[PDB]
Amino acid sequence: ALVATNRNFQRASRILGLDSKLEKSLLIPYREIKVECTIPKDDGSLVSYVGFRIQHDNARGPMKGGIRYHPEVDPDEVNALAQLMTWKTAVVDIPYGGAKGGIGCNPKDLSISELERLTRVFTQKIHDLIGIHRDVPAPDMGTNSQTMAWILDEYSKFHGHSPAVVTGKPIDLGGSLGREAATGLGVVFATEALFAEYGKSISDMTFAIQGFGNVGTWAAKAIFERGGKVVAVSDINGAISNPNGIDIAALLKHKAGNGSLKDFSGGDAMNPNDLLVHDCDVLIPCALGGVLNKENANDVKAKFIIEAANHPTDPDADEILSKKGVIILPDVYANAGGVTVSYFEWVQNIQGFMWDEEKVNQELKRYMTKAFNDIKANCKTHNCDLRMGAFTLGLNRVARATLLRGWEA
Amino acid sequence: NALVATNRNFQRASRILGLDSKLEKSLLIPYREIKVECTIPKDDGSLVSYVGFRIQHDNARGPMKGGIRYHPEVDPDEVNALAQLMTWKTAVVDIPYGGAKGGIGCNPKDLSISELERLTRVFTQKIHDLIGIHRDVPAPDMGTNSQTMAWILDEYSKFHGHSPAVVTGKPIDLGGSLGREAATGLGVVFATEALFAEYGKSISDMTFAIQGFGNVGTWAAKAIFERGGKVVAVSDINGAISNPNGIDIAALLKHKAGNGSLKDFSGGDAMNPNDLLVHDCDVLIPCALGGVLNKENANDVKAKFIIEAANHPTDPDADEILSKKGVIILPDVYANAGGVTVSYFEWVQNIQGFMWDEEKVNQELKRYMTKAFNDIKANCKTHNCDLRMGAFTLGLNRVARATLLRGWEA
Amino acid sequence: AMNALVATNRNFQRASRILGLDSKLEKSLLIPYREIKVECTIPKDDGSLVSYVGFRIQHDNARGPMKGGIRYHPEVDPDEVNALAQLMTWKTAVVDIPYGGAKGGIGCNPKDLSISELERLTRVFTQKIHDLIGIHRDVPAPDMGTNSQTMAWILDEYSKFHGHSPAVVTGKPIDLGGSLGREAATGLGVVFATEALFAEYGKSISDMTFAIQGFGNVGTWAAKAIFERGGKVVAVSDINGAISNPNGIDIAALLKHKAGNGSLKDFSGGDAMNPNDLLVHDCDVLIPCALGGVLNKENANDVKAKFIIEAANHPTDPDADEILSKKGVIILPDVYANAGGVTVSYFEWVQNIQGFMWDEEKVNQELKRYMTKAFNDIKANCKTHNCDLRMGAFTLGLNRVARATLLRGWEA
Amino acid sequence: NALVATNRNFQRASRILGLDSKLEKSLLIPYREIKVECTIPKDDGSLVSYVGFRIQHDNARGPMKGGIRYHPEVDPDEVNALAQLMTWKTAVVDIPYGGAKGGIGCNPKDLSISELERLTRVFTQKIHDLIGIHRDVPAPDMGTNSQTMAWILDEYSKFHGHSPAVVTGKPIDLGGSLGREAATGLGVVFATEALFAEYGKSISDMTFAIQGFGNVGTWAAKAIFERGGKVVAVSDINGAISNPNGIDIAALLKHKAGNGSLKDFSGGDAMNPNDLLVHDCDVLIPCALGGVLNKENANDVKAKFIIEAANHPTDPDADEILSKKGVIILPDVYANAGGVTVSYFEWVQNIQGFMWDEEKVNQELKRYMTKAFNDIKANCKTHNCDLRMGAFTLGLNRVARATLLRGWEA
Ligand SMILES: NC(=O)c1ccc[n+]([C@@H]2O[C@H](COP(=O)([O-])OP(=O)(O)OC[C@H]3O[C@@H](n4cnc5c(N)ncnc54)[C@H](O)[C@@H]3O)[C@@H](O)[C@H]2O)c1
Ligand SMILES: NC(=O)c1ccc[n+]([C@@H]2O[C@H](COP(=O)([O-])OP(=O)(O)OC[C@H]3O[C@@H](n4cnc5c(N)ncnc54)[C@H](O)[C@@H]3O)[C@@H](O)[C@H]2O)c1
Ligand SMILES: NC(=O)c1ccc[n+]([C@@H]2O[C@H](COP(=O)([O-])OP(=O)(O)OC[C@H]3O[C@@H](n4cnc5c(N)ncnc54)[C@H](O)[C@@H]3O)[C@@H](O)[C@H]2O)c1
Ligand SMILES: NC(=O)c1ccc[n+]([C@@H]2O[C@H](COP(=O)([O-])OP(=O)(O)OC[C@H]3O[C@@H](n4cnc5c(N)ncnc54)[C@H](O)[C@@H]3O)[C@@H](O)[C@H]2O)c1
Ligand SMILES: O=C(O)c1cccc(-c2nnn[nH]2)c1
Ligand SMILES: O=C(O)c1cccc(-c2nnn[nH]2)c1
Ligand SMILES: O=C(O)c1cccc(-c2nnn[nH]2)c1
Ligand SMILES: [Ca+2]
Ligand SMILES: [Ca+2]
Ligand SMILES: [Ca+2]
Ligand SMILES: [Ca+2]
């Protein structure tokens, strides 16, 4: 997370020839905030936490980023996550900068009313630092749409009804349709555009998918409905194989009945540790980072790797897979459908008028497609891989937004 | 009035949802009640003092919305019920507002046009800090009109900058929306179409008797007529006209515009207005007054559908009698919501800085009335209740879950 | 209470006639600037919901920010609450402090609520009205059912919305900007007003005997302040008993006796008395400091005092007023006599507005200046209108609010 | 050093108060910590980027107060300890402030005066929403001065209007207070009068040795001299001068102003500066550095009183040794508080829109220092502790009382 973002920035920065003093400024966050969050517990005794918000950059618009309720709050990693938000939003051309915040706590130690009091106190402590056009939080580790409802409710006492102050809200409070499928569907839209470069379609390819959660389930469904052959799916408990393509609609039925993959009758049970070296045209890691390293890299038999999980390829595998002719669609772009639909929720709220799910998906496609074209165009200016096309694209957009605004007081 | 009807429907819907009684109490208590002194100098230099008010009932689902009445009758419980009714109505058609109701206890016909302007501006000065484009958005009502709203807009904007969305019902020249005059009558016809689609039928299959021929009745009849429905009977306060082959509503409208009276229309036969509700037809549409259907005449109703365009036309006796006769009643809280819906669209257009054409207003109105009927119908399935309770439980449940999601900690 | 409604109405109508108030101006002065009711819902300590209605009547602000208490009390009759807010508008005008009147509260019984429920309720109430109050808009204060701890919570909650705002509320703890001199303010103000009254006759407090009904916050300090000025306190009663001494009670010793949980009847430096004879006791000066409605037609003819200082609110009903008047009894009216408390409350606001607290000698020096100036104005008014002291005070305050209103004007 | 001394004194005072451990955790966590990018163009057109910061420790007793340091070393733990020490110090002399501390990691010698102005204004733009007359009131510190404050005032006022009280230490021409230069040294002498009055003694009864002759030492020496005290020894970084009759401080000041060195003054005998702390006197006043009294020289101190004007001059080893010899030590947290106290008076005068003359400033400074000593001594009686713990328990408890009164519910 930390180490990948640092290296990718340094690689992209040298490709762009970034001015060293501009680079220094871009690395310094706009603002770092730490606040006391003290609440009474349900039994009346006090507990005290520190909440935080790193606001990295706002050259391209309000800041955007999750709120983590999690006990590990290493400042360098939180800073890297906020920077990564700044580059990711710039890659897909949404008008935001990057931020990241949270509270150093373990939510599983706290009752639902304690979580509410903690969230409202946190909002009271930062209400003057966020805002619909200033900094727009979202769920992350340890928070969810109920958390956002509390932030919305508390913030609105200080500034009036502000549905756009936060994304990831319950539908009943201005949340957007289409959020659940956003990332998985965005993966497939990105893949459509990539394959369009070869005049090929998803229906021409076979797919192996590692991980079968929110990203994995929706990606498989969208691939299956577009004629792709999902020939292998794994998750943490097992794996299933079918050289003629698994009936993914039927597989999802089985999963919903609390069944395990290997027990599916429309395929052959498989060892999950064989999923990455499986023979297929396209590999899509949707589980964990660091699954591709120097060890297994030569044994990957896929022609395309769609990085849906964050950082599944360490630099060792990247170099190895590159020379073999493997094309890797990078994580900062490939899984960006979620943050993109989060932008649409914000847009729908500032417009006072919600979109239907078909409009959400039409705009998601338009944004993911125009983003791939811009990445590919950058790869053609700098003669670099797709990962560097994306990072130079985002880094340059932040840089020239920063330069246009200027430096005088 | 509207108070007995609203309290009864709230209590029935509350029992069906199994609403927690302490949540129920909170939903009944208005967010805020305001009364302000409104004193103006008259044209002749003397002083007069009135009391203005704004009941802000609920804002769990969004900014409050509601009319301003210039009227001498300011009973607090009735005004509370009207504000409460707004909260449920906006929830029924899924527009992101809560309910409010305000006004000034005065008789507008005792005031000259300049006295009315000074009064409107003073009221705005006294409440400007309590309203706003995302807080509470007033609209016309009894005794006020689009000119009143222009004055509120102009005075409010001195305190907060140009804010066309602070009020709806504006003149077209100041950000008012197209499609407002037809909104309610057309919304009734969209609602009636969606109901008939449940039976695979069309408006063109039906005959219609319409009580009332004002802003709602004229536009409802026009929209029915242009869709091939047969409007066989129309009444208003002075008479009624009948034609079993369908009245030519286009000609009836020209007649009304030419200062004509219903019973003098030659393309039909004069009728006793008291025969309207018991007339032989498929669809009855009260568009005039409340309380017209009671235990006396309910058993004499000969229609299969009743589309409630006026507010509270069926008292509980008739609702009972009509149900076990197989009569299907589309409830007023939903059927006439086209007006409040286009009022929302005007706000949306102002918020978006860009007006819609009338085709777009009516396409969205249709989408909103249709999606609302489907949601009502789905509720009927889950709760095994009629359309009136499907609608009230839908709106009440939406307000309750917005409230529960927002929470209670300080 | 109910007596405050009837008394405030009668006094307003009487003063309005003496002044010849224009009836449309009078109609406007009776209509409050603003009436607010808000939902106040909180979780109880057990997690269940409870819902109350809070309210704030903002009667008048022609002369400055509104000022008035917050009552946590179950009886919230609109006409009475309205009368109380209006009474504050007249009271602040009588002593020339730059406030209008307001009155607010929550319909609840505080004894039913734990300290943590009361805090949550207070903060929610503040969240619901923070935009309607303010240091130069409306400044609440303690009242029935609230105290300085309640004010600390309002201050803490209000300041989240507007920054640290110590002047938004008076009656605060000393630790949070409260003023010195609050405890003695009303009783000490009573004695200052009495000094000014007796000066008209070339007499001083050391010349008089005093009978005092009630021995709480007002009665103890008034008796103490009289005693230190050489007045002879010959009778004191409270709800449980009474003590008399025609030579004067050693009030310093009486106060020590009370502080040790002693009863007035059991005091050794006097003779026990029937409390029902306190008002007809043989003295120069009678000071009701307990309850309203104590002087009526039954007993007015038997009052032996030549001066009665109304420290409690409305202790004399209209029947006794007429009877005492024709007997030559001079009545210093409650609206003025007990105004020391609200005056030091203004001083707290002033100290917070100035960012710099006064010492107690300064507070009291100013309290005396304000009560003495106020008496001179009341007396001057009695000269021009040829009326008793009660109407001197009401016409003074009513006229000041009227003139502030007329100067501000009526055009939008 | 401020981190280990402040932590040791807090923990000791907390154990004396029986402070609840969960309250103590809250009191140690700062209200808010801010870091902001401060980038400016240099005079030559190139860019430079610094990090500005503001630690806002506590505001239970009032707006935050604290200096702004332009200095390259910005250790977070040291800056937190300084902001927290401010919170206790303001509570000890009972001024209505909490503690804060901020600055910019830069070397002001590397920057021209116009670059320093732009940097100050950029810093102000980045934090204007976090400071304010009733929120957080900065002041000069290392590397900043009254010209820096004028720039902050000037830039802040573009965002919130003319706000003279947003910063203290301003030039006299822009709302600064009279009496600010002498404030600390004069405050030291007021504190000493209050202490000596407990013994029925006066300053004129005592002999004084002063280490350091800067802004604190010169004014304390002057204020002692005008009260009949005998200043028998003075040192600074380059030398020392001695006179058991009492040095003519008026002449010594005039010598210093004429660019003279202590060892070259003729109205005394030149002395080794290393002998100042062991000089023969009743009262020793460290006004130079911390850590000058330790176990090595503590047994050799001949004074009966030590007035801590410098910060942390006595380590715990010497404090132990001196107390067992019967030495009374007036603690730094109180003794040197005249500077912060007059800074409060500047803020007061600004919010009152009307400046005081220097007579009134010094009169109020004396009243504040006198009442603070009385409160400290009362605390010593209550807890049976020395003056240092009398002062810290006083300040810590006042902050604890204010946060407990304010409460914890959301
Ligand atoms: N959901 C989003 O909006 C989003 C956006 C950007 C990136 N991502 C990335 O996508 C990845 C997955 O996100 P998600 O929401 O689908 O998570 P999820 O928890 O919904 O699903 C994770 C899936 O991976 C499987 N898995 C876990 N450990 C595994 C292991 N060791 N080997 C194989 N399979 C394993 C799980 O069983 C599950 O099927 C993460 O890297 C995340 O950072 C998600
Ligand atoms: N216009 C809207 O947007 C709207 C919205 C919701 C509800 N409503 C309800 O619709 C009803 C009518 O509204 P409108 O705007 O069309 O009013 P309107 O004044 O424009 O027309 C009322 C019509 O009813 C007739 N009428 C009056 N009394 C009658 C009686 N006793 N018997 C028969 N006819 C009678 C009048 O002559 C006229 O034809 C009212 O109940 C109103 O509350 C209107
Ligand atoms: N305290 C103030 O700041 C203040 C200010 C203005 C007016 N007042 C008025 O002063 C009166 C007393 O106020 P307080 O603060 O001293 O009250 P308190 O509760 O502190 O004391 C009231 C006293 O009256 C006594 N008492 C009660 N019933 C009695 C009876 N039937 N006969 C004799 N004594 C009786 C009580 O025992 C007690 O001694 C009230 O009318 C109040 O409205 C008080
Ligand atoms: N000035 C204030 O407002 C203020 C307020 C509170 C505390 N203090 C503390 O007072 C002390 C001095 O402050 P100041 O403003 O007078 O400083 P200053 O820089 O104006 O003067 C310091 C003096 O100490 C002398 N000195 C330096 N090192 C010395 C050494 N090793 N031996 C002997 N003398 C030495 C210098 O020569 C000079 O005379 C510091 O500890 C500071 O933290 C100052
Ligand atoms: O009168 C109200 O309370 C009110 C408030 C907002 C909109 C509408 C409306 N427009 N058309 N029909 N109703 C009415
Ligand atoms: O009750 C009020 O309305 C009110 C408001 C502010 C101050 C006081 C007060 N203090 N002492 N006596 N009265 C009363
Ligand atoms: O530097 C600080 O923390 C600070 C903040 C406000 C005032 C003072 C001050 N004035 N004189 N001595 N100290 C210092
Ligand atoms: Ca930066
Ligand atoms: Ca409610
Ligand atoms: Ca009025
Ligand atoms: Ca803290």
CSV table of C-alpha atoms in Angstrom, one decimal, chain C residues 59-298:
chain,number,residue,atom,x,y,z
C,59,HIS,CA,-41.6,39.1,23.9
C,60,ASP,CA,-39.8,42.4,23.1
C,61,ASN,CA,-36.4,43.6,22.0
C,62,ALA,CA,-36.9,47.3,21.4
C,63,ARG,CA,-34.4,48.1,24.2
C,64,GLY,CA,-31.7,45.5,23.6
C,65,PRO,CA,-31.3,41.7,23.6
C,66,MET,CA,-34.0,39.6,25.2
C,67,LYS,CA,-33.4,38.3,28.7
C,68,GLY,CA,-35.3,35.7,30.7
C,69,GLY,CA,-35.2,32.4,32.5
C,70,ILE,CA,-35.6,28.8,31.4
C,71,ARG,CA,-38.0,26.8,33.4
C,72,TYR,CA,-37.9,23.0,33.6
C,73,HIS,CA,-41.5,22.6,34.9
C,74,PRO,CA,-44.5,20.7,33.8
C,75,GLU,CA,-47.0,23.6,33.7
C,76,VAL,CA,-46.5,25.5,30.5
C,77,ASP,CA,-49.8,27.4,30.1
C,78,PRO,CA,-49.2,29.8,27.1
C,79,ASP,CA,-51.0,32.8,28.7
C,80,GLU,CA,-48.9,32.5,31.9
C,81,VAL,CA,-45.6,32.0,30.1
C,82,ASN,CA,-46.5,34.9,27.8
C,83,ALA,CA,-47.3,37.1,30.8
C,84,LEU,CA,-43.9,36.2,32.4
C,85,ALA,CA,-42.0,37.2,29.3
C,86,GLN,CA,-43.9,40.4,29.1
C,87,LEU,CA,-43.3,41.1,32.8
C,88,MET,CA,-39.5,40.8,32.2
C,89,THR,CA,-39.8,43.4,29.4
C,90,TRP,CA,-41.3,45.9,31.9
C,91,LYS,CA,-39.0,45.0,34.7
C,92,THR,CA,-35.7,45.6,32.7
C,93,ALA,CA,-37.1,48.9,31.5
C,94,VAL,CA,-37.9,49.9,35.1
C,95,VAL,CA,-34.3,49.7,36.3
C,96,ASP,CA,-33.0,50.9,33.0
C,97,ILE,CA,-31.0,47.8,31.9
C,98,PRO,CA,-30.7,47.5,28.1
C,99,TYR,CA,-32.7,44.3,27.6
C,100,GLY,CA,-36.1,43.2,26.5
C,101,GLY,CA,-38.0,40.3,28.0
C,102,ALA,CA,-38.2,36.6,27.1
C,103,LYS,CA,-39.2,33.4,28.9
C,104,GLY,CA,-38.6,29.8,27.9
C,105,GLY,CA,-38.5,26.3,29.2
C,106,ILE,CA,-39.2,22.6,28.7
C,107,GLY,CA,-42.4,21.0,29.8
C,108,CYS,CA,-40.9,18.3,32.0
C,109,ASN,CA,-40.4,17.4,35.6
C,110,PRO,CA,-36.7,17.5,36.3
C,111,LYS,CA,-37.0,15.2,39.4
C,112,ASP,CA,-38.0,12.5,36.9
C,113,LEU,CA,-34.7,12.8,35.1
C,114,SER,CA,-31.1,11.8,36.0
C,115,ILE,CA,-28.2,14.2,35.9
C,116,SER,CA,-27.1,12.6,32.6
C,117,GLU,CA,-30.7,12.8,31.1
C,118,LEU,CA,-30.9,16.4,32.2
C,119,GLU,CA,-27.6,17.1,30.4
C,120,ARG,CA,-28.7,15.5,27.2
C,121,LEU,CA,-32.0,17.3,27.4
C,122,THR,CA,-30.3,20.6,27.9
C,123,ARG,CA,-27.9,20.1,25.0
C,124,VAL,CA,-30.7,19.0,22.6
C,125,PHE,CA,-32.8,22.1,23.6
C,126,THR,CA,-29.8,24.3,22.9
C,127,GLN,CA,-29.2,22.6,19.5
C,128,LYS,CA,-32.8,23.3,18.8
C,129,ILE,CA,-32.7,27.0,19.6
C,130,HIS,CA,-29.1,28.1,19.1
C,131,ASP,CA,-30.0,30.1,16.1
C,132,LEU,CA,-32.7,32.0,18.0
C,133,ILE,CA,-30.6,33.1,21.1
C,134,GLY,CA,-27.2,34.8,21.2
C,135,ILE,CA,-25.1,37.3,23.2
C,136,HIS,CA,-26.9,40.3,21.5
C,137,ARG,CA,-30.1,38.5,20.6
C,138,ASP,CA,-31.5,36.5,23.6
C,139,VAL,CA,-29.6,35.6,26.8
C,140,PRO,CA,-31.2,32.9,28.9
C,141,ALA,CA,-30.8,32.4,32.7
C,142,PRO,CA,-31.7,29.9,35.4
C,143,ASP,CA,-35.3,29.7,36.6
C,144,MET,CA,-37.6,27.1,38.3
C,145,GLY,CA,-36.1,23.7,37.7
C,146,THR,CA,-32.7,24.9,36.4
C,147,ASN,CA,-29.4,26.1,37.9
C,148,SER,CA,-25.9,27.2,37.1
C,149,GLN,CA,-25.0,23.7,36.0
C,150,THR,CA,-27.8,23.9,33.4
C,151,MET,CA,-26.3,27.1,32.2
C,152,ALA,CA,-22.8,25.5,31.9
C,153,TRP,CA,-24.4,22.9,29.5
C,154,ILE,CA,-26.1,25.5,27.4
C,155,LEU,CA,-22.8,27.4,27.2
C,156,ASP,CA,-20.9,24.3,26.3
C,157,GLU,CA,-23.4,23.3,23.6
C,158,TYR,CA,-24.0,26.7,22.2
C,159,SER,CA,-20.2,27.3,21.8
C,160,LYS,CA,-19.9,24.4,19.4
C,161,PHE,CA,-22.1,26.4,17.0
C,162,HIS,CA,-20.8,29.9,17.5
C,163,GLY,CA,-17.5,29.7,19.4
C,164,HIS,CA,-16.8,30.2,23.0
C,165,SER,CA,-19.7,32.6,24.1
C,166,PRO,CA,-19.8,33.2,27.8
C,167,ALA,CA,-22.3,36.1,27.5
C,168,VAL,CA,-24.9,33.9,25.9
C,169,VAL,CA,-26.2,32.9,29.3
C,170,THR,CA,-26.1,34.3,32.8
C,171,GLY,CA,-26.1,32.5,36.2
C,172,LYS,CA,-23.1,30.5,35.1
C,173,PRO,CA,-20.7,28.8,37.6
C,174,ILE,CA,-18.0,31.2,38.8
C,175,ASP,CA,-15.6,28.7,37.2
C,176,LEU,CA,-17.1,29.5,33.8
C,177,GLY,CA,-17.6,33.3,33.9
C,178,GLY,CA,-20.2,33.7,36.5
C,179,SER,CA,-20.3,37.0,38.4
C,180,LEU,CA,-19.5,37.6,42.1
C,181,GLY,CA,-22.3,39.0,44.2
C,182,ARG,CA,-25.1,36.9,42.8
C,183,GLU,CA,-26.3,35.3,46.0
C,184,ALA,CA,-26.9,38.6,47.9
C,185,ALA,CA,-28.1,40.5,44.9
C,186,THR,CA,-31.8,40.5,45.4
C,187,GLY,CA,-31.9,41.0,49.1
C,188,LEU,CA,-29.1,43.6,49.0
C,189,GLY,CA,-31.0,45.3,46.2
C,190,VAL,CA,-34.1,45.3,48.4
C,191,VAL,CA,-32.2,47.2,51.1
C,192,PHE,CA,-30.7,49.7,48.6
C,193,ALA,CA,-34.2,50.4,47.3
C,194,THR,CA,-35.4,50.8,50.8
C,195,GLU,CA,-32.6,53.2,51.6
C,196,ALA,CA,-33.6,55.4,48.7
C,197,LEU,CA,-37.2,55.4,49.7
C,198,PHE,CA,-36.5,56.4,53.3
C,199,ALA,CA,-34.2,59.1,52.1
C,200,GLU,CA,-37.2,60.9,50.8
C,201,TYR,CA,-38.3,61.3,54.4
C,202,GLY,CA,-34.9,62.2,55.7
C,203,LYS,CA,-34.9,58.8,57.5
C,204,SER,CA,-32.4,55.9,57.4
C,205,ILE,CA,-32.7,52.2,57.9
C,206,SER,CA,-31.3,52.6,61.5
C,207,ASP,CA,-34.5,54.5,62.4
C,208,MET,CA,-36.9,51.7,61.7
C,209,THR,CA,-38.1,48.4,63.0
C,210,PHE,CA,-38.6,45.5,60.5
C,211,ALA,CA,-40.8,42.4,60.2
C,212,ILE,CA,-39.7,40.0,57.5
C,213,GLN,CA,-41.8,37.2,56.1
C,214,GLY,CA,-39.7,34.4,54.7
C,215,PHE,CA,-36.1,33.5,55.4
C,216,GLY,CA,-34.6,32.0,52.2
C,217,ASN,CA,-32.3,33.6,49.6
C,218,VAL,CA,-34.1,36.9,49.7
C,219,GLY,CA,-35.0,37.0,53.4
C,220,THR,CA,-31.7,36.0,54.8
C,221,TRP,CA,-29.6,38.5,52.8
C,222,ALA,CA,-32.1,41.3,53.3
C,223,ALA,CA,-32.2,40.8,57.1
C,224,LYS,CA,-28.4,40.6,57.1
C,225,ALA,CA,-28.0,43.8,55.1
C,226,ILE,CA,-30.6,45.6,57.3
C,227,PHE,CA,-28.9,44.4,60.5
C,228,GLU,CA,-25.5,45.7,59.4
C,229,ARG,CA,-27.1,49.1,58.8
C,230,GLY,CA,-28.6,49.3,62.3
C,231,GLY,CA,-32.1,48.4,61.5
C,232,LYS,CA,-34.0,46.5,64.2
C,233,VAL,CA,-35.4,43.2,62.9
C,234,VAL,CA,-38.2,42.6,65.4
C,235,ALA,CA,-39.9,39.6,63.7
C,236,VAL,CA,-38.9,36.9,61.2
C,237,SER,CA,-41.1,34.0,59.9
C,238,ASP,CA,-40.7,31.1,57.5
C,239,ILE,CA,-42.8,28.1,56.6
C,240,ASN,CA,-42.0,26.3,59.9
C,241,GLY,CA,-42.2,29.0,62.6
C,242,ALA,CA,-41.4,32.5,63.7
C,243,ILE,CA,-39.4,34.5,66.2
C,244,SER,CA,-39.8,38.0,67.5
C,245,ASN,CA,-37.7,40.3,69.6
C,246,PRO,CA,-38.9,43.9,70.2
C,247,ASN,CA,-35.2,44.9,70.9
C,248,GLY,CA,-34.1,43.6,67.5
C,249,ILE,CA,-32.9,40.0,66.7
C,250,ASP,CA,-29.2,39.5,66.5
C,251,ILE,CA,-29.4,38.5,62.8
C,252,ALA,CA,-25.8,37.4,62.6
C,253,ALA,CA,-26.5,34.9,65.4
C,254,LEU,CA,-29.8,34.0,63.9
C,255,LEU,CA,-28.0,33.2,60.6
C,256,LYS,CA,-25.5,31.0,62.5
C,257,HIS,CA,-28.4,29.2,64.1
C,258,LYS,CA,-30.0,28.6,60.7
C,259,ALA,CA,-26.7,27.4,59.3
C,260,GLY,CA,-26.5,24.7,61.9
C,261,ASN,CA,-29.9,23.4,60.8
C,262,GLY,CA,-31.8,25.2,63.5
C,263,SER,CA,-35.4,26.3,63.4
C,264,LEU,CA,-36.6,29.9,63.9
C,265,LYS,CA,-38.9,28.9,66.8
C,266,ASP,CA,-35.9,27.2,68.6
C,267,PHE,CA,-33.8,30.3,68.5
C,268,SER,CA,-32.7,31.5,71.9
C,269,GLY,CA,-32.3,35.2,71.1
C,270,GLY,CA,-36.0,35.8,70.7
C,271,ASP,CA,-39.5,34.6,71.6
C,272,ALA,CA,-41.4,32.1,69.4
C,273,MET,CA,-44.3,33.6,67.5
C,274,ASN,CA,-47.3,32.4,65.5
C,275,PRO,CA,-46.3,32.8,61.8
C,276,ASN,CA,-49.9,33.8,61.0
C,277,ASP,CA,-49.4,37.1,63.0
C,278,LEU,CA,-46.2,38.2,61.1
C,279,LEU,CA,-48.1,40.4,58.7
C,280,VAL,CA,-50.1,42.2,61.5
C,281,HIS,CA,-47.0,42.6,63.7
C,282,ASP,CA,-46.3,46.0,65.2
C,283,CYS,CA,-43.4,47.5,63.2
C,284,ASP,CA,-42.5,50.3,60.9
C,285,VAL,CA,-41.6,48.2,57.9
C,286,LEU,CA,-43.1,45.0,56.6
C,287,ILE,CA,-41.1,43.0,54.1
C,288,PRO,CA,-42.9,40.0,52.4
C,289,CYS,CA,-40.1,37.8,51.1
C,290,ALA,CA,-41.9,34.5,50.8
C,291,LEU,CA,-45.1,34.1,48.8
C,292,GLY,CA,-47.7,36.0,46.7
C,293,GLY,CA,-51.2,36.8,47.8
C,294,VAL,CA,-50.4,37.2,51.5
C,295,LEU,CA,-52.1,40.6,51.8
C,296,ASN,CA,-55.9,40.6,51.0
C,297,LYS,CA,-59.1,42.1,52.4
C,298,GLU,CA,-59.1,39.8,55.4
